[PDB]
Swiss-Prot record, chain A:
The gene is atpD. Produces ATP from ADP in the presence of a proton gradient across the membrane. The catalytic sites are hosted primarily by the beta subunits. It comes from Pseudomonas paraeruginosa (strain DSM 24068 / PA7) (Pseudomonas aeruginosa (strain PA7)). Belongs to the ATPase alpha/beta chains family. It is found in: Cell inner membrane. F-type ATPases have 2 components, CF(1) - the catalytic core - and CF(0) - the membrane proton channel. CF(1) has five subunits: alpha(3), beta(3), gamma(1), delta(1), epsilon(1). CF(0) has three main subunits: a(1), b(2) and c(9-12). The alpha and beta chains form an alternating ring which encloses part of the gamma chain. CF(1) is attached to CF(0) by a central stalk formed by the gamma and epsilon chains, while a peripheral stalk is formed by the delta and b chains. This is ATP synthase subunit beta. The chain holds residues 227 to 342 of 458 of the full protein.
Curated annotation (Swiss-Prot), chain B:
It comes from Pseudomonas paraeruginosa (strain DSM 24068 / PA7). F-type ATPases have 2 components, CF(1) - the catalytic core - and CF(0) - the membrane proton channel. CF(1) has five subunits: alpha(3), beta(3), gamma(1), delta(1), epsilon(1). CF(0) has three main subunits: a, b and c. Its main location: membrane. The keyword Nucleotidyltransferase does not apply. GO terms for molecular function: ATP binding; proton-transporting ATP synthase activity, rotational mechanism. It comes from the Bacteria. GO terms for cellular component: plasma membrane; proton-transporting ATP synthase complex. InterPro entries: ATP_synth_F1_ATPase_gsu, ATP_synth_F1_gsu, ATP_synth_F1_gsu_CS. This is ATP synthase gamma chain. It is a peripheral membrane protein. Keywords: ATP synthesis, Cell inner membrane, Cell membrane, CF(1), Hydrogen ion transport, Ion transport, Membrane, Transport.
From Swiss-Prot, chain C:
Belongs to the ATPase epsilon chain family. Its main location: membrane. It is found in: Cell inner membrane. One of its GO terms (molecular function) is proton-transporting ATP synthase activity, rotational mechanism. This is ATP synthase epsilon chain. The keyword Chloroplast does not apply. F-type ATPases have 2 components, CF(1) - the catalytic core - and CF(0) - the membrane proton channel. CF(1) has five subunits: alpha(3), beta(3), gamma(1), delta(1), epsilon(1). CF(0) has three main subunits: a, b and c. One of its GO terms (cellular component) is plasma membrane. The chain holds residues 72 to 130 of 141 of the full protein.
Swiss-Prot record, chain E:
The chain holds residues 258 to 343 of 514 of the full protein. F-type ATPases have 2 components, CF(1) - the catalytic core - and CF(0) - the membrane proton channel. CF(1) has five subunits: alpha(3), beta(3), gamma(1), delta(1), epsilon(1). CF(0) has three main subunits: a(1), b(2) and c(9-12). The alpha and beta chains form an alternating ring which encloses part of the gamma chain. CF(1) is attached to CF(0) by a central stalk formed by the gamma and epsilon chains, while a peripheral stalk is formed by the delta and b chains. It comes from the Bacteria. This is ATP synthase subunit alpha. Belongs to the ATPase alpha/beta chains family. Disulfide bonds: none annotated. It comes from Pseudomonas paraeruginosa (strain DSM 24068 / PA7) (Pseudomonas aeruginosa (strain PA7)). It is found in: Cell inner membrane.
């Protein structure tokens, strides 16, 4: 946000957005709050919104974010993936098969998508 | 009930999907064995046709009854991708021409699914053979072929045809009807009488054409079986994907319910 | 035989009037149809459409 | 649904319909994977009758007329038993499967098959 | 080299103490800090640089790197790797 | 399921139809309006009745269309009209 306010376009890399959700679940349990669906914190959507709504394009500059995503039990309907996908604008999928052919970067042009 | 029954259904369908994927290649392997057997029998039929052509042109002294004016091939087993149905559907098209012409029909049947078809509609069977191996032998066809040849010599049949599938390509089996009985510088040195030679060669010619129709239908069957097992493998994959979605719902419900019973129990203590 | 070609067209079994007739008579006996019928079979389309749809719905 | 309350004719017709629909429900997974053509000659006939019974159970209502346009139908118990008994006995094996859909009494299935 | 023959039994013992101390339960009744229990233990297994060994030993050991390798063992239930502790 | 128990009909949008290029992806097979039949104007009410049946005739033949060109004239005309209405 300081670099954005200097009039720049900035990249914010988040090592794993699932670990941010889990840290919120752990803190919520330590504070004694009543758990929600699948055992997540009752504040799941608000905690994601407070972080994701600051990453935007403004009149001064912008912050673009690349976030690594982990899907629990390969279930795309789980509350963590389901809450995260509401904020994403693009999906880049890396393929082990494409890397085996010697092509780099190993993006899958068929599975990867963008709202743009 | 819950997650346990769904997990058992998935495992059962997953085991079946693996063999239908493998059996598709087993059918392709058997398709290639049938295709080499189709080619191996051609030199004999074409030379018999070359001999009869000259031996009839050069000898205007005698005209065989076969030179002046249905045998149905079907499978003995399951997994056929519409092979027998497309053939029976087509037989009616040529029979319709016979109904407009007012002509009578005699039928010969090769294979168990063909016998089951005519038996379910009241079709008049003059001869029938079944339970032949995937690699048949011409000596089993002699019986069924002779009854149909005799009916021609007795004047009971005006024209005879062989109904079978033709191998257009590895993805296409075509239903067909082919006429069997009604078909220059030197002369041959006949040891026996020419009538005996022409009469003997014409019998070998028709038997050879019926055998080639049977072997080409078996190549079409293995090609149809490949498509059918490919489709079964693909169809099972859609069922497993849907059952995985139902399982995930039960996984989330079990975790939510256990926590709701646990939180209620700790609030009372 | 021809001046530049020799073709031998062999037979798979020993033909004869008895074996040749017997296979035909056995094929009449094998045509075991308790009720012979007529052959008109007007239900062709009713069965052909059912199986055409069933074979399409499978794919 | 007791022989001492409704009589044996109604009771056996209802039990016959349930037996056919139960057997059709057991074949659903096999039909989805291998198709209808792999079933036995007995199962094929039962599945064909199950599909007709399942469609004959449908009925246009006098309160549902606004949704589609079709006129409503009132079917007596006598006509209901006669229709399902005939389908179970095989008296309608020749009529097409779509002739039973939305027709009230069994005689209307015979008239719908003429189109 | 260190082998922890059952980290799942350590988690069960810590869950017992936490429930008897009346601390708030989460998924599978484990406390909110069960991830921190195993993470605090497993991040000690490491390889340290020559400068770390030279600083720790006050120059008694020079030009050598030390290490601790860990082989933790965990028991699954009917192959379910999606359980909380696993 | 709670909102369907309150509202007077639902417009279902299908993911398969949307990914197939049919962008206004309304699923006619299950989308319904209870009070809306009395709300249409005379011109749209009279012309729409013939169009909902055409889409019902297409729903059963759409997937098999590539090899359906050899069927009877009735089946072929119903499919051809169904593709044009779609």
């Amino acid at each position: 946000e300081k670099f954005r306010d200097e009039g720049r376009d900035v990249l914010l890399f988040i090592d794993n957005i699932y670990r941010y959700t889990l840290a919120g679940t752990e803190v919520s349990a330590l504070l004694g709050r009543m758990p929600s669906a699948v055992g997540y914190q009752p504040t799941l959507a608000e905690e994601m919104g407070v972080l994701q709504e600051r990453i935007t394009s403004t009149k001064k500059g912008s912050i673009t974010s690349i976030q690594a995503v982990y899907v629990p039990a390969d279930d795309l309907t789980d509350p963590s993936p389901a809450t995260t996908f509401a904020h994403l604008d693009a999906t880049v999928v890396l393929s082990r098969d494409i890397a085996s052919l010697g092509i780099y970067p190993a993006v899958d042009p068929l599975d990867s998508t963008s709202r743009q | 009930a819950g997650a346990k029954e769904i997990r058992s259904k998935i495992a059962s369908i997953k085991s079946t999907q693996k063999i239908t994927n493998a059996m598709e290649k087993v059918a392709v392997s058997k398709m290639r064995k049938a295709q080499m057997r189709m080619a191996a029998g051609r030199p004999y039929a074409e030379r018999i046709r070359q001999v009869i052509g000259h031996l009839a042109n050069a000898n205007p002294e005698y005209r065989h009854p076969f030179m002046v004016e249905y045998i149905v091939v079907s499978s003995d087993r399951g997994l056929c991708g519409g092979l027998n149905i497309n053939l029976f559907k087509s037989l009616v098209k040529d029979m319709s021409g016979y109904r407009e012409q007012g002509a009578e029909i005699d039928l010969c049947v090769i294979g168990s699914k063909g016998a089951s078809f005519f038996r379910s509609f009241g079709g008049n069977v003059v001869a029938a053979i079944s339970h032949l191996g995937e690699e048949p032998s011409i000596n089993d066809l002699i019986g069924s072929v002779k009854v149909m040849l005799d009916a021609y010599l007795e004047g009971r049949i005006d024209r005879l045809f062989v109904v079978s599938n033709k191998f257009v390509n590895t993805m296409t089996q075509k239903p067909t009807v082919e006429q069997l009985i009604p078909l220059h510088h030197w002369d041959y040195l006949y040891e026996p009488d020419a009538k005996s030679l022409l009469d003997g060669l014409l019998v070998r010619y028709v038997e050879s054409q019926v055998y080639q129709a049977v072997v080409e239908n078996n190549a079409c069957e293995q090609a149809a079986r490949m498509i059918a097992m490919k489709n079964a493998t693909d169809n099972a994959g859609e069922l497993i994907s849907d059952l995985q979605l139902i399982y995930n719902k039960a996984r989330q419900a079990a975790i939510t319910q256990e926590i709701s019973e646990i939180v209620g129990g700790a609030a009372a203590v | 035989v021809q001046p530049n070609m020799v073709k031998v067209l062999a037979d798979t079994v020993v033909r004869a009037g008895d074996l040749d007739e017997a296979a035909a008579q056995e094929a009449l006996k094998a045509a075991e149809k308790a009720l012979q019928g007529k052959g008109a079979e007007f239900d062709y389309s009713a069965a052909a459409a059912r199986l055409a749809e069933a074979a399409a719905q499978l794919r | 649904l007791d022989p001492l309350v409704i009589g044996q004719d109604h009771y056996d017709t209802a039990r016959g319909v349930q037996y056919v629909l139960q057997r059709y429900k057991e074949l659903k997974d096999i039909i989805a994977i291998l198709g209808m053509d792999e079933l036995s000659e007995a199962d094929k006939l039962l599945v064909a009758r199950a599909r007709k019974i399942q469609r004959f159970l449908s009925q246009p209502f006098f309160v549902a007329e606004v949704f589609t346009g079709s006129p409503g139908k009132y079917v007596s118990l006598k006509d209901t038993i006669a229709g399902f008994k005939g389908i179970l006995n095989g008296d309608y094996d020749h009529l097409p499967e779509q002739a039973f859909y939305m027709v009230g009494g069994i005689e209307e299935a015979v008239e719908k098959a003429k189109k | 080299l260190i082998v922890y023959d059952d980290l799942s039994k350590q988690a069960v013992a810590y869950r017992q103490i936490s429930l008897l101390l009346r601390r708030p339960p989460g998924r599978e009744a484990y406390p909110g800090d069960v991830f921190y229990l195993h993470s605090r233990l497993l991040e000690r297994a490491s390889r340290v640089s020559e400068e770390y060994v030279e600083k720790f030993t006050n120059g008694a050991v020079t030009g050598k790197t030390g290490s601790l390798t860990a082989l933790p063992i965990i028991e699954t239930q009917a192959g379910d790797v999606s359980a909380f502790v696993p | 399921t709670n909102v369907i128990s309150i509202t007077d009909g639902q417009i279902f949008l299908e993911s398969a139809m949307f990914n197939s290029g049919i962008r206004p992806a309304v699923n006619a097979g299950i989308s319904v309006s209870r009070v809306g039949g009395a709300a249409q104007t005379k011109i749209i009410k009279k012309l729409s009745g013939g169009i909902r049946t055409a889409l019902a005739q297409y729903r059963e033949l759409a997937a098999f269309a590539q090899f359906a060109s050899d069927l009877d004239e009735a089946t072929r005309k119903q499919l051809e009209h169904g593709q044009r209405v779609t």
